[PDB]
Amino acid sequence: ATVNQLVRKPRARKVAKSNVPALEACPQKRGVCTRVYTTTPKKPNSALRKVCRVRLTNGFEVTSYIGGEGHNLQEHSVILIRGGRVKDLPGVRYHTVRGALDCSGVKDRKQARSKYGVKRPKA
Amino acid sequence: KIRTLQGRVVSDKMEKSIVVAIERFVKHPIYGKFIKRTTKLHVHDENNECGIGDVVEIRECRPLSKTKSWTLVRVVEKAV
Amino acid sequence: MVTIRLARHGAKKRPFYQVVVADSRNARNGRFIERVGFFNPIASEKEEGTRLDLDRIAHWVGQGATISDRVAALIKEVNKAA
Amino acid sequence: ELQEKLIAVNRVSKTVKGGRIFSFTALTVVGDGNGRVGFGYGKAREVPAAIQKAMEKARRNMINVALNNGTLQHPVKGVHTGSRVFMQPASEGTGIIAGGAMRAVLEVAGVHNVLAKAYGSTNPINVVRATIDGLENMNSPEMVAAKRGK
Amino acid sequence: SMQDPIADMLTRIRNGQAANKAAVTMPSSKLKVAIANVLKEEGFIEDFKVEGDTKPELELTLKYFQGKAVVESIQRVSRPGLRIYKRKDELPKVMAGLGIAVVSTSKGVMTDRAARQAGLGGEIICYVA
Amino acid sequence: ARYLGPKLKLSRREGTDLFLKSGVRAIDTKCKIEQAPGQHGARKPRLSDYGVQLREKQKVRRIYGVLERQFRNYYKEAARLKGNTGENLLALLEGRLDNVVYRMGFGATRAEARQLVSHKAIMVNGRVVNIASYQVSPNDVVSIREKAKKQSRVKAALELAEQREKPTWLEVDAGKMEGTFKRKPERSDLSADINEHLIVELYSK
RNA sequence: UAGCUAGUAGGUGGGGUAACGGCUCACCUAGGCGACGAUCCCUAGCUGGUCUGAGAGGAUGACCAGCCACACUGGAACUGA
RNA sequence: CCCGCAGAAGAAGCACCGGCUAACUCCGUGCCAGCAGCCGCGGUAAUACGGAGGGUGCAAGCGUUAAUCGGAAUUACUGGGCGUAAAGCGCACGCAGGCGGUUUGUUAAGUCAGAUGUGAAAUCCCCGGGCUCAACCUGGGAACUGCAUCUGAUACUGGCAA
Ligand SMILES: [Mg+2]
Ligand SMILES: [Mg+2]
Ligand SMILES: [Mg+2]
Ligand SMILES: [Mg+2]
Ligand SMILES: [Mg+2]
Ligand SMILES: [Mg+2]
Ligand SMILES: [Mg+2]
Ligand SMILES: [Mg+2]
Ligand SMILES: [Mg+2]
Ligand SMILES: [Mg+2]
Ligand SMILES: [Mg+2]
Ligand SMILES: [Mg+2]
Ligand SMILES: [Mg+2]
Ligand SMILES: [Mg+2]
Ligand SMILES: [Mg+2]
Ligand SMILES: [Mg+2]
Ligand SMILES: [Mg+2]
């Protein structure tokens, strides 16, 4: 309030807790697949979502989401992950770059293939 | 004189080791209010002569010591 | 000793020099004392192409500056009075 | 120079023994392009009835505004409920920059070259309204001398 | 506490005005007067009046034009807690130009129109329109 | 970079003739224009202010055949310059060479007038300028290269060029096939059916 | 993190440096700093400027130019303008 | 950079189309497979999943992720709040600190004025000039809102006096 008051103790701007410690602001981070779970979503929804807990290059162990329809990923697969939560799966805050490292692309995808990492099918 | 400084005494109690207070007002660079930014200076005064409470005029000389780059010029007032 | 020389503020394949007085020991495009002309060698025959405050160059050569080789030419190529 | 535009249309529910009974609301602005603007609310169980009933309300409830050319004399502040709004002469660059919603009143009302901004809640019913009152309080660029003179 | 009297002037006015009060009075001072001047000379008040000697009394006659009060607003700007000073080029203009700002200078309390012409500046006491 | 796609489709969505088949026939039809720009074109596009704002600039763009990037920079340059940002925008657009080649008649549509530019079949104040966006200035003098003169296209080009309302700001031969950008077109020349302030607004927020 | 400080603060003289100087020494005075934040801890090369913002700000210090600093790590001096 | 030669010949992709937000239908699926920036879509007619036709948007790029500021007046100096929504210390006394009625004189520190110097060049910006345009390059201005020195002005604030 008071001017004195601002003088003693300046206005301070809260700092921004990130939502995705892909450590140090990194576009993505490599990791090794600890577990390949599949768990089920929150309240309204109901499904068998695929995920994987992943040891990261920088030591973080993070649970990441696997996108697409069907995937070949087991324990010891080396993957790449990006930011991107999944509200449904509380706790999951990262996605797996399909068609990166050992991660395959989604079989047969025709629409939006670059997400899901799928080559331009030999038209 | 190439500039001079005024200021009250603050401490006389030391074989010429005179230190003087200087008082400016300045606009707070952020909230515009004016505050008191004080400066203390370690000034020389041969044969000790000023006393705590004296206003005094002062000038910038070369180093008389690691601390001292100012001698005094005149005195002004006493028995505060 | 101070010197008059060409800094090359050109641009790949189309050089355009500043002419500067500076401590000869510094970099060809580094700290200098004052600028004293310019020299576009692609001037084109149109108009300008070698403006050059002589009465300063003068001053420094008075104060002991050496001149480049190229610059020396330019001065004796500006002619001098006309 | 009839000139009119509706700003926001909305649904609202009433709730009775038998369920929700819904209905709509319309917020409109009309002006001549030369001062004079009004807004109208008016609600109704169907949309076209609501906007119609509104355009009407706006025809009356019309105030006028001591413009100064295509612009405003002095920069004015307005405020009603949660909407606290501000607009400025702007020696027209082009001008007419505001949040579509008070661009609406400006536009029709004949102002041609302001810059504006709304603070607080963007709730139209109160911003278009804080603005009208805004332009209204705004006093005459010489009938300030009328004021003084003596 | 009495601490800021100039706001009190500006205020006793603002208030009484809004109370469609004919006159209004208060403890006076060199300063109150210099402004009561500019206020009159700019035509925001009818005329002042200082009626005392040991305990002087500034008195202002208010004005009402249409039905309104003439002084549509009157704010402090500098104040003990926070002094304002503007150089000449940085002087403020109220309501785009209409209405005025009272600026005290090394050559006396005068408006912004005034000080701006005088080519100087000082402490911007208050805003009026 | 060039649009390249079936070009009437555009006029149809944009609802108006952008003169992109310019050539022979006029007042379209022999096309379909209007009531089905797609498979649901039939439908009423009751559309947001954003949309009407969007489609206006789109219209202007499909016209001079300018892609987003360049158009943006046009807008930006327009705005930099004093004068009505929206007018200035329209000015720059016209200042385009390719445009001031179709406008002098040497080319059927701006698309064609352009192929000419890129194919080094033009010369400003003497010299050959093969870049479609070469801004043209008052008193300039755009001719056709002697090599390939009165060749096919360029005839019928200078032909129906007179069918058109026909400029004012530019005087132009037809035998030599030279012509002089006399002045920067004013607001009042060209237009009517184009709404700057909208595409000033689209780029204002 | 609320106290910090013995070459510590000042004086006198000897010595020293290209040069003023607790720079160093000997001896004397008992000072010097500190809530206008010392001391302690954490982080950090500074600038011009760069990005953003209507501004005020916020963020930032690659590429260009200026200054500083470092040259396997710690320490030293020799040569030399 | 210029001239000739051949033949449209070698040269289009990516995201999106439930609302925000420009762009809609069919088939498959059936709280599954799955989508998802936010709201939230999926249990038999899904414009929201996947495919297809069509469309919208950008184009040698297009999407996704990461990152700064913006919108956020959401740390509010400009520019915010604390009866009931986040927020008046359970109450008091008071040091430092902040602020302080009214008069005259004095001072000239705060404040104001002018002059001088300085504020590197590049950058930014205005007007031009040169590369076929542009990016790019360059002339010249403008600007660097700052700092200091000197001399002045004394209404306000600070100091001294009564
Ligand atoms: Mg491109
Ligand atoms: Mg000694
Ligand atoms: Mg802002
Ligand atoms: Mg390098
Ligand atoms: Mg070493
Ligand atoms: Mg040696
Ligand atoms: Mg839509
Ligand atoms: Mg999708
Ligand atoms: Mg179906
Ligand atoms: Mg903010
Ligand atoms: Mg609040
Ligand atoms: Mg509460
Ligand atoms: Mg209480
Ligand atoms: Mg007083
Ligand atoms: Mg500079
Ligand atoms: Mg040019
Ligand atoms: Mg006084």
HEC readout, chain D: CCCEEEEEEEEEECCECCECCEEEEEEEEEECCCCCEEEECCEECCHHHHHHHHHHHHHCCEECCCCECCECCCCEEEEECCEEEEEECCCCCCCCECCCCCHHHHHHHCCCCCEEEEEECCCHHHHHHHHHHHHHHCCCCCHHHHHCCC
Residue F90: strand, helix, or coil? helix
Alpha carbon of B14 to those of B48, B51, B75: distances in Å? Answer: 8, 10, 17
Return d(Cα E77, Cα E122) in angstroms, integer. Answer: 12
Experimental method: X-ray
Whether the beta carbon of B68 falls within 7 A of nucleic chain G: the reply is yes
Q: Where are the domains of chain C?
A: 1-81
F191: its two tokens: 């237009």
SS3 of chain A: the string is CCHHHHHHCCCCCCCCCCCCCCCCCCCCEEEEEEECCEECCCCCCCCCEEEEEEEECCCCEEEEECCCCCCCCCCCCEEEEEECCCCCCCCCCEEECCCCCCCCCCCCCCCCCCCCCCCCCCC
Question: Which of A66, A71, A61 minimizes the C-alpha distance to A32?
Answer: A61
CA distance D6 to D54: 9
Query: Which nucleotides on chain G have any atom < 7 A from a protein Cβ?
Result: 9-11, 20-23, 28-34, 36, 58-59, 64-67
Q: Which secondary structure element, helix H or strand E, spans residue E40, and what is its range?
A: helix E30-41
- CA distance linking residue F12 with residue F144, whole number of Å: 33
Q: Which amino acid is at D61?
A: N
Domains and CATH numbers, chain F: 7-93+190-203 (1.10.1050.10), 94-181 (3.10.290.10)
CA distances from D55 to D2, D29, D124 (A): 11, 7, 16
Q: What are the structure tokens assigned to F115, written together?
A: 């192929």
- Dihedral, CA of residue F178, residue F184, residue F190 and residue F195, to nearest 10: 140
Angle of CA points F164, F167, F173, to nearest 5°: 90
Q: In what order do the strands lie in the sheet with D76-80?
A: D76-80, D83-88, D115-120
Residue nearest to nucleotide H24 (CA to C1'): F40
Pick from B5, B10, B7: which is nearest to B51 by CA?
A: B10
Domains of chain E in start order, with CATH, are 1-71 (3.30.1370.30), 72-129 (3.30.1490.10)
Specify the nucleotide whose C1' lies closest to residue F134 (CA).
H133
Q: What is the DSSP letter of F198?
A: H
Q: Chain A residue closest to E79 (CA)?
A: A3
D18 contacts: CB under 8 Å, gap ≥ 6: none
Backbone phi and psi for residue F9, each to the nearest 5 degrees, phi listed first: -20, -45
Which helix (DSSP H) or strand (DSSP E) does residue E76 occupy? Answer: strand E74-76
| Structural element, H or E, at residue C2 | strand C2-8
Amino acid identity of residue A105, one-letter, is: G
**Alpha-carbon gap, residue F178 to A84, rounded angstroms:** 61
Q: Which residues pair with D83 in a beta bridge?
A: D80, D120
**Residue extents of the structural domains in chain A:** 1-123
- Please list, in sequence order, all residues whose beta carbon lies within 8 angstroms of the beta carbon of residue B5, skipping any fewer than 6 positions away: B20, B22, B41, B57, B58, B59, B70
Q: Using only C-alpha atoms, what is the Rg of chain D? A: 17
C-alpha D7/C-alpha A119 separation (Å) is 48
User: Counting beta carbons within 10 angstroms of the beta carbon of residue E85, is it exposed (0 to 12), middle (13 to 18) or buried (19 or more)?
Assistant: middle
Distance CA B42, CA B20 (A): 7
Residue A64 β-bridge partners: A52
Residue of B nearest to E78 (CA): B33
> Do the Cβ atoms of C19 and C36 come closer than 8 Å?
yes
Closest CA to A64 of A115, A29, A27: A29
Rounded-to-integer distance, Cα F202 and Cα F56, Å: 9
* Rounded Cα gap, residues A120 and A98, in angstroms: 15
Residue A79 near residue A31, CB atoms below 8 Å: yes
Characterize the bridge pairing of strands F140-141 and E108-111.
unpaired
Determine the residue type at C73: A
CA of E79: how far to CAs of C72, D12, E124, in Å? 67, 50, 10
Sequence-separated (6 or more) residues with CB below 8 Å from residue D110? D31, D32, D33, D34, D35, D36, D65, D67, D70
Residue B20's φ and ψ, nearest 5 degrees, are: -125, 140
CA atoms lying within 13 Å on the CB side of residue F178: 13
Total count of residues recorded for chain D: 150
Q: Which residues of D touch E44 (CB under 8 A)?
A: 148
CA distance D61 to D54: 11
Please say whether the beta carbons of A28 and A101 come within 8 A.
Answer: no
Amino acid identity at A74: Q
Residue E104 bridge partners (DSSP): E109, E123
Give phi and psi for C55, each to the nearest 5.
Answer: -65, -5
CA distances to C10, C57, C81, E92 from C51, in Å: 16, 12, 13, 47
* Locus of tokens 């005024």: B6
- Report in angstroms the alpha-carbon separations of E92 from A43, D94, D115, E87: 60, 26, 20, 10
Nearest to B18 by CA among B38, B43, B40, B39: B43
How far from the centroid of its chain's Cα atoms is residue D135's Cα?
9
Indicate if CB(B2) is under 7 A from strand G.
Answer: no
- Cα A89-A90-A95 angle, rounded to 5 deg: 60
Contact present, B35 and B25 (Cβ < 8 Å): yes
The Cα of E104 is separated from the nearest Cα of chain B by a number of Å equal to 18
- For F67, the token pair is 């892609």
Q: Of F122, F141, F145, F144, whose CA–CA distance to F180 is shortest?
A: F141
* F:144-163 Cβ neighbours of strand H under 7 Å: 147
Nucleotide nearest to D115 (CA to C1'): G54
Amino acid at A88: D
Six-digit token pair at F160? 């129906």
Nearest to F66 by CA among F108, F103, F20: F20
DSSP state of E39: H
CA dihedral sign, ordered F171, F177, F181, F185: positive
- Residue C19 · residue C38 · CB < 8 Å: yes
- Cα–Cα–Cα angle for A8, A9, A13, rounded to 5 degrees: 155
In angstroms, rounded to a whole number, what is the distance separating the alpha carbons of residues F13 and D120? 40
Residue the block writes with tokens 């080009």: F157
Residues 6+ apart with CB under 8 A from F54: F202
Classify each residue of E39-68 as buried b or exposed e, where b means 16 or more C-beta atoms within 10 Å of its C-beta: bbebbbbbebeeeeeeeeebbbebbeeeee
Which of F32, F43, F31, F34 is CA-nearest to residue F13?
Answer: F34
Positions on chain H within 7 A of a protein C-beta: 2-4, 8, 12-16, 20-25, 31-42, 50-60, 62-69, 72-73, 75-77, 80-82, 88, 97-104, 109-114, 120-121, 125-127, 129-134, 136-140, 148-150, 152-157
Tokens (6 digits) for D141: 């660029």
Give the angle B7-B13-B18 at the CA atoms, nearest 5°: 40
Upper half-sphere CA count for residue F115 (Cβ side, 13 Å): 8
Cα–Cα distance measured from residue E59 to residue E49, given in angstroms and rounded to the nearest whole number: 5
Question: What is the Cα gyration radius of chain A?
Answer: 20
Q: Locate breaks in chain C with C to N over 2.5 A; list the residue preceding each.
A: none
Copy the structure tokens of residue D31.
């002006």
Contact, A29 vs A80, CB < 8 A? yes
| A106 and A82 Cβ atoms separated by less than 8 Å | no
Q: In angstroms, rounded to a whole number, what is the distance separating the alpha carbons of residues B3 and B58? A: 9
- Phi and psi dihedrals of D116, rounded to 5? -135, 165
- Give one word for F117, left, alpha or beta, with left for phi > 0 and alpha for psi -120 to 50: alpha
> Which CATH number among 2.40.50.140, 1.10.150.120, 3.90.550.10, 3.30.1330.200 corresponds to the domain A1-123?
2.40.50.140
